[PDB]
Structure 1
Amino acid sequence: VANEPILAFSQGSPERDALQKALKDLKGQTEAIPCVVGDEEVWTSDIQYQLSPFNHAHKVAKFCYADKALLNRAIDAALAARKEWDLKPMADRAQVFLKAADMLSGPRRAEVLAKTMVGQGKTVIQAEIDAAAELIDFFRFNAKFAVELEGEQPISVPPSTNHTVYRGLEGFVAAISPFNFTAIGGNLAGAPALMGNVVLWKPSDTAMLASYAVYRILREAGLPPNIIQFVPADGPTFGDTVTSSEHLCGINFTGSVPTFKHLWRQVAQNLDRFRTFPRLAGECGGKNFHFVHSSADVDSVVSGTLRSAFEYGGQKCSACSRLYVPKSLWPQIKGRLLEEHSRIKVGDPAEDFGTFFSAVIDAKAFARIKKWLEHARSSPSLSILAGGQCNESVGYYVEPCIIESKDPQEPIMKEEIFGPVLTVYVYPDDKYRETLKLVDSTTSYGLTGAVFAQDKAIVQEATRMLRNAAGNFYINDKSTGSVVGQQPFGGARASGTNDKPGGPHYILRWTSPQVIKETHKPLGDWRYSYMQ
């Protein structure tokens, strides 16, 4: 398989016309999205709404929370379907995801793009690299990796033949996905299902519209009933219920560190009830850096940092939020950042394709980001250089904000904001090595980071010093935008278990291999010849 092409959406292109039509189709619409258990559409009385981030008077979806009883019924029905699904040949399960990929690539591309734009506030290009390219690639590449894994077989020596069976996990997997990438939900539920597991998928409230579109495509591509249950739910209720089931065998999580730790501790408390040891996979965010050496190409520093810090409002686990600049380059980089900042358009991405990024996801995110801006107006070490405005009267709109910190270990240099907030620390050129150590030691995270430098010896030194500061490390490129099969994604420290979705080993977390030895001759006597 090859990577899905990123379309250019030029004027008069087929994809731009198709997208504009899909956006027009959605403009005044609310979809009633039920829970799906097997083939049954289930409504509870716990009604919820997904709002359009840039126009929160527009309810894009009405959905409901599954209660404990519905979740337990979804577990029971999934468990009853698991054996038949696990016994299917790997190629037959892969075919579902390959057909779903082809649907997303072609006739459903505009739909999933438009639903990600209106429901999660993404611009055209951010929806294209997410709901199309990345999700399509997850499905195609994981299918390839899984079919290839069946060929990894042990040595056979006469008179015995050995065969490895890549079993699904026995039980069900709980998939808990975040708002910020439509593709991640598809992968968190889809990769375990591909490997023969059955899944309860709790999608993110703030991404329900696009998440359900993906779910329906999987069902239409041939996913049998009760292999993935579509079960929006209150977060704590969902976690309590699945960690209370004796049949839990895995959690595939992406979200906050505290939630992942909570789930981990619930599993540990309940170890005595489970039939097997559940497998927890988590990607938990980062406080990612762009580190600049005095030899860097300034124009690449500027555009790469503007994109990494502000695309999709900074709402990426991989977004740059700390920029380290040598004093000798600061007049250039400050001047260019501030001039380009004034050209950034924030607005409605469905109506204005000139928009660079739009509103942040919801009222909770808006309130959290505003608190950080108020902190930046209070702290003696912080100064807002540009931006700092926010307005939630129409959408949850936060202007891009550039802050300078005189303190390299200020809280704003350490804590994940998940908003369009970039903090810059200016270091003396002669304190370069000491500052590299600060990049490594300042935060608890280890997800992404970039070094900009045109000096080979400097790049080699920085690469060694930052070896554990980033699981996705970039030389002269921005810290966001990993591509399936090219940059498998994840990191350690507090950023998670680093199972590297997008690479060939991720699917191994969702299989429990069995080795069958068949002997084709009689065994003979139990004694040994040396005993005589």
Structure 2
Amino acid sequence: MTVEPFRNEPIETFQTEEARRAMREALRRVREEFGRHYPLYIGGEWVDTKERMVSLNPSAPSEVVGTTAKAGKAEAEAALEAAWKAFKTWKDWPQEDRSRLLLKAAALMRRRKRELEATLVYEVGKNWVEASADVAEAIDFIEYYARAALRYRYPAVEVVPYPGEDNESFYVPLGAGVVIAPWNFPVAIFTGMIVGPVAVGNTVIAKPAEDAVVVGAKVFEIFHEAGFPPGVVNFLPGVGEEVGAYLVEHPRIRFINFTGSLEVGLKIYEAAGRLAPGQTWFKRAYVETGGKDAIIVDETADFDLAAEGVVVSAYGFQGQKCSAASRLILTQGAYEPVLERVLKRAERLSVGPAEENPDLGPVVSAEQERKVLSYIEIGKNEGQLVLGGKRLEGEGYFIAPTVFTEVPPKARIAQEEIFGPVLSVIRVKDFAEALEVANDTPYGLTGGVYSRKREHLEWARREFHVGNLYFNRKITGALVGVQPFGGFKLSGTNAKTGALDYLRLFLEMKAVAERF
């Protein structure tokens, strides 16, 4: 109640000369900075190592955007020591003080937004608007969680009174935990998963994805400048199956906040359920995994509106979003009209170096390129290729917008997360069958419906089993505070980010009674 009500950070469109000028200068400075080395951040200080992590420009992989130190078991141990030592006092900070620290960090991040956006363009291949949306979401997480944390301040629990006694229940943080983040939203998700737990008194050891270690380091430069006490937040870039797994299985790690693939999420959730030797608690593990998101369009929809939303949802950031539309379910009456419009729009999409602000930049790495191309080959034997399906010319990892149609609902390309610019179109009889097909996957993250029929929309509101459902609009771009984000089924544990409920996940409750 001491700051203005939360509002989302505007996403820059770069339509004004001022915006373009600022972005061009930011891109130039980041490019001129290629090759910089960023150390680990442990206990309030930057610590270098002998080994290193290399981050390449996916639009021109011969170019090294930057390098960072590489955390091994020894560095993980040092971070654990620092995080637990810091927790001892950080947990006792008044919530108002912790929240003000977050607000300071948000102000600092906002002042460096163009630089962060430019870093995303070069490090992970996002075009200009995708980069702006990423950083805007990161700022939103900080602003939102700073305010939400105050709702849990001492003593926040509603209890029933008892004669002759004071009964007080309140929340306390868990301790030191590990954050393991993805490369697709390396500023937003990385920031959110760290600051949420930290806001309410926990301390964190952050493990950025290998493909986005440089931007992760820049986020830590902001944390350092903001003044977080030594040990409260630690930066440990390194190999997931190495330092990441080491921390996940550690007896002294209190919680794990993970966002990534289902394959890894399953391993982490299983490991979290085990009592490591000497462990004295039941670990909490929050795992937000992938999705196989569908957009249903029936014959009553605005076909042009639907086609535009489908193209944005399927190809934004080259389809490398957990929320991306990878399935397009069309009822018989909508099939021809919508598919023709989708193909016409998709074939006009530009693909090229992210710095040029194309509709699509490159996929993030050589391995991701190999995987997407492999799925395209699988798709050719499952459905009918009607657009793209090839790597484009150039050193960058450029893949053309791809569309398969007449895809069987149980085909691999209609069930497995490809995480590339590949859309599978499924033809169904009616809306009931559309919902059946939409629900018949192991996932349940995002989904959409384009329809003018009220009964179909309200039917879907109840029966389309996804955590984030959107009607007559794109299914990507969930806004902090507006759309609590998180899925069902194998899309994760339903830890809703950008929602009041998120912080409760990093707190435990104590009930204290005094009989007078």
- TM-score class, shorter-chain normalisation, is over 0.9
Structure 2 counterpart of 1:299? 304
- Looking at structure 1, the residues matched to 172 and 282 of structure 2 have their Cα atoms a distance apart, in angstroms, of 15
Q: Report the alpha carbon displacement of residue 513 of structure 1 after superposing the two structures with TM.
A: 2.1
| From 375, 378, 390, the counterpart of 1:375 | 378
- Looking at structure 1, the residues matched to 10 and 347 of structure 2 have their Cα atoms a distance apart, in angstroms, of 32
Larger Rg: 1
Q: Cα deviation per residue 1:233-283 (whole Å; 9 max; x = unaligned)?
A: 211222342244322110000011121221222233335531211110010
Q: Decide whether the 8 Å contact of 1:154 with 1:162 is kept in 2.
A: no
- Looking at structure 2, the residues matched to 398 and 50 of structure 1 have their Cα atoms a distance apart, in angstroms, of 20
* Residue 396 (str. 1) matches residue 403 (str. 2): no
| From 140, 147, 150, the counterpart of 1:147 | 150
Q: TM-score, normalised by structure 2?
A: 0.95
Q: Decide whether the 8 Å contact of 2:269 with 2:287 is kept in 1.
A: no
Q: Cα deviation per residue 1:451-489 (whole Å; 9 max; x = unaligned)?
A: 1110111222233331xx211011111211100111000
Structure 2 counterpart of 1:450? 448
Q: Cα deviation per residue 1:278-316 (whole Å; 9 max; x = unaligned)?
A: 110010010000011110110111010000000000000
Q: Secondary structure at the match of 1:494?
A: helix
Equivalent pairs counted in the alignment come to 507
| Letter of the 1:153 counterpart | V
- Looking at structure 2, the residues matched to 180 and 400 of structure 1 have their Cα atoms a distance apart, in angstroms, of 18
- Looking at structure 2, the residues matched to 213 and 207 of structure 1 have their Cα atoms a distance apart, in angstroms, of 10
- Looking at structure 1, the residues matched to 497 and 279 of structure 2 have their Cα atoms a distance apart, in angstroms, of 26
Q: Decide whether the 8 Å contact of 2:450 with 2:471 is kept in 1.
A: yes
| Letter of the 1:99 counterpart | K
- Looking at structure 1, the residues matched to 393 and 54 of structure 2 have their Cα atoms a distance apart, in angstroms, of 18
Q: Decide whether the 8 Å contact of 2:181 with 2:258 is kept in 1.
A: yes
- Looking at structure 1, the residues matched to 102 and 138 of structure 2 have their Cα atoms a distance apart, in angstroms, of 10
Structure 1 counterpart of 2:137? 134
Q: Decide whether the 8 Å contact of 2:272 with 2:285 is kept in 1.
A: no
| From 465, 472, 484, the counterpart of 2:468 | 472
- Looking at structure 2, the residues matched to 392 and 60 of structure 1 have their Cα atoms a distance apart, in angstroms, of 22
Alignment of 1:27-106 (within 5 A): 27-28=31-32, 29-105=34-110
Task: Give the direction of change, closer, same or farther, for the CA distance of 1:153–1:463 in structure 2 (3 Å limit).
Answer: closer
Q: Report the alpha carbon displacement of residue 158 of structure 1 after superposing the two structures with TM.
A: 5.8
Q: Decide whether the 8 Å contact of 2:354 with 2:362 is kept in 1.
A: no
Q: Decide whether the 8 Å contact of 1:72 with 1:241 is kept in 2.
A: no
Q: Decide whether the 8 Å contact of 1:320 with 1:479 is kept in 2.
A: yes
Alignment of 1:119-518 (within 5 A): 119-131=123-135, 133-150=136-153, 152-155=156-159, 156=161, 159-170=164-175, 172-181=176-185, 182-271=187-276, 273-350=278-355, 352-353=356-357, 355-377=358-380, 379=381, 381-391=382-392, 393-428=394-429, 431-441=430-440, 443-466=441-464, 469-518=465-514
Q: Decide whether the 8 Å contact of 1:239 with 1:263 is kept in 2.
A: no
Q: Decide whether the 8 Å contact of 1:243 with 1:270 is kept in 2.
A: no
- Looking at structure 1, the residues matched to 507 and 275 of structure 2 have their Cα atoms a distance apart, in angstroms, of 22
Q: Decide whether the 8 Å contact of 1:177 with 1:204 is kept in 2.
A: yes
| Letter of the 1:384 counterpart | L
Task: Give the direction of change, closer, same or farther, for the CA distance of 1:89–1:438 in structure 2 (3 Å limit).
Answer: same
| Letter of the 1:217 counterpart | I
| Higher mean C-alpha displacement, 326-335 vs 499-508 | 326-335
- Structure 1's consecutive aligned runs of 4 or more residues displaced over 6 angstroms after TM superposition are none
Q: Decide whether the 8 Å contact of 2:481 with 2:499 is kept in 1.
A: yes
Between the aligned residues of both structures, percent identity stands at: 32
- Looking at structure 2, the residues matched to 501 and 424 of structure 1 have their Cα atoms a distance apart, in angstroms, of 30
Q: Cα deviation per residue 1:343-388 (whole Å; 9 max; x = unaligned)?
A: 10111221x23x11200011110000010111233x1x41111111
- Looking at structure 2, the residues matched to 484 and 265 of structure 1 have their Cα atoms a distance apart, in angstroms, of 29
Q: Cα deviation per residue 1:412-444 (whole Å; 9 max; x = unaligned)?
A: 10000000000101223xx43233212212x10
Q: Decide whether the 8 Å contact of 2:67 with 2:214 is kept in 1.
A: no
- Looking at structure 2, the residues matched to 339 and 477 of structure 1 have their Cα atoms a distance apart, in angstroms, of 19
Unaligned runs of at least 5 residues, structure 1 = 522-532
Q: Cα deviation per residue 1:47-90 (whole Å; 9 max; x = unaligned)?
A: 22111111111111111321111111111121111111000011
- Looking at structure 1, the residues matched to 249 and 291 of structure 2 have their Cα atoms a distance apart, in angstroms, of 30
Q: Report the alpha carbon displacement of residue 331 of structure 1 after superposing the two structures with TM.
A: 2.5
Q: Decide whether the 8 Å contact of 2:385 with 2:403 is kept in 1.
A: yes
Task: Give the direction of change, closer, same or farther, for the CA distance of 1:358–1:271 in structure 2 (3 Å limit).
Answer: same
Structure 1 counterpart of 2:3? none
Q: Secondary structure at the match of 1:229?
A: strand
| Letter of the 1:423 counterpart | S
| Higher mean C-alpha displacement, 154-163 vs 196-205 | 154-163
Q: Secondary structure at the match of 2:403?
A: strand
| Higher mean C-alpha displacement, 82-91 vs 24-33 | 24-33
Q: Secondary structure at the match of 2:212?
A: helix
Q: Decide whether the 8 Å contact of 1:116 with 1:209 is kept in 2.
A: no
Q: Decide whether the 8 Å contact of 1:386 with 1:403 is kept in 2.
A: yes
Q: Report the alpha carbon displacement of residue 396 of structure 1 after superposing the two structures with TM.
A: 0.7
Q: Secondary structure at the match of 1:164?
A: strand
Unaligned runs of at least 5 residues, structure 2 = 1-5
Q: Report the alpha carbon displacement of residue 406 of structure 1 after superposing the two structures with TM.
A: 4.0
Q: Report the alpha carbon displacement of residue 121 of structure 1 after superposing the two structures with TM.
A: 0.7
CA RMSD between the two structures: 1.7
Q: Secondary structure at the match of 1:136?
A: helix
- Looking at structure 1, the residues matched to 238 and 31 of structure 2 have their Cα atoms a distance apart, in angstroms, of 26
Q: Cα deviation per residue 1:314-342 (whole Å; 9 max; x = unaligned)?
A: 00000000001123222322222222122
Q: Report the alpha carbon displacement of residue 154 of structure 1 after superposing the two structures with TM.
A: 3.1
- Looking at structure 2, the residues matched to 435 and 201 of structure 1 have their Cα atoms a distance apart, in angstroms, of 41
| Letter of the 2:303 counterpart | V
| Letter of the 1:490 counterpart | G
- Looking at structure 1, the residues matched to 226 and 134 of structure 2 have their Cα atoms a distance apart, in angstroms, of 20
Q: Report the alpha carbon displacement of residue 393 of structure 1 after superposing the two structures with TM.
A: 4.2
Q: Report the alpha carbon displacement of residue 494 of structure 1 after superposing the two structures with TM.
A: 0.3
Task: Give the direction of change, closer, same or farther, for the CA distance of 1:153–1:264 in structure 2 (3 Å limit).
Answer: closer
